[PDB]
Amino acid sequence: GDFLVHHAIALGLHTTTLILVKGALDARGSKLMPDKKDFGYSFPCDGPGRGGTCDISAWDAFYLAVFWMLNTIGWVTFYWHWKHITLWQGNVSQFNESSTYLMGWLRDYLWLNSSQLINGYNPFGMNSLSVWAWMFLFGHLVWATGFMFLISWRGYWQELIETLAWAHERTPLANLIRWRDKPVALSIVQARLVGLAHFSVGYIFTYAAFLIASTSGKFG
Amino acid sequence: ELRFPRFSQGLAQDPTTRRIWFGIATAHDFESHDDITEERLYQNIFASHFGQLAIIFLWTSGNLFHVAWQGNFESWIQDPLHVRPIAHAIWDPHFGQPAVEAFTRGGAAGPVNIAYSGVYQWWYTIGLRTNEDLYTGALFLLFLST
């Protein structure tokens, strides 16, 4: 089991490096745009021409990189926790057999060890673990809000604001209040940054809740 | 200039709300500030660093203060393997009654949080032994932050 996981760890480091190293060396320029240096580290894109240039700034190379970092560190901490959580119980056979097929990781680590966490509060009562049960879902909620900014891009929301900024300008008793700063949808880069902020926060809080509750539930 | 942000004129005249969002993300990027010079670039960084040390020392004076005002540090020493280390106390006025009971543990009198940062063992090893060592430990770091 420890053989196969280590390559999965090794896969993360190269692929994570590949994005970052590809970002660094092509920062000054490349064939798709050989004067990328004239725009800075972070710029949105370069327009639809030449076949479309979405996600070309060296910034975006850092952007995609973080996803592979969280996945990679996901595969590392997962491995450390399960190997130790079987050891501390003196049940070392369970890891050494289940850890060779994926359903073993999904059944015997995720599904099995979260039995005490999700009962933090039920229609029967609550426990000390309730706060970790709440944060657990709170992790799922922020993470799922992250997708909203990564998938849905700006031009849609901008047309949505304009209708809204018309409705507010015609409603009686509410045309007496006027924005000082005009309302516009977030910029293209901002959405990526904002979208990644949610994804990371939700990804840390979710795992951090499961890690503490499941272990402290048994204290062993 | 003429308004927030003071360090970027191009953003200042942006009328939309874009200015506010972008006046926060580009605060610390000292190169792209307007009218920057290589002497300022370093002198801001040097002053900013001391700001980051102030936070680190103030942060660590928080831990010592609570562990020695609401914690189990003197009791935990007496049996490290059966006394949950205590991080701080809980006062949340939304709590109902069965939660107040549930979060009362570690030999406290009200709700508490169990400390999982492992400070309790580290300070045991490096020689701290009562609450009082911790209080002066708090004051000193607070002074270093000042």
Binding site: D181 | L2, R3, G23, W91, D92
Partner: peptide, 30 residues
């Protein structure tokens, strides 16, 4: 005792004065 005073102050008052202080500074014009 002391938490019952300091928790609201940092939870309710200190936020309110903070938000209202920034809002004027952000929205100034000179």
């Amino acid at each position: 005792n002391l938490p019952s005073i300091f928790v609201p102050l940092v939870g309710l008052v200190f936020p309110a004065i903070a938000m209202t202080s920034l809002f004027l500074y952000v929205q100034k014009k000179k």
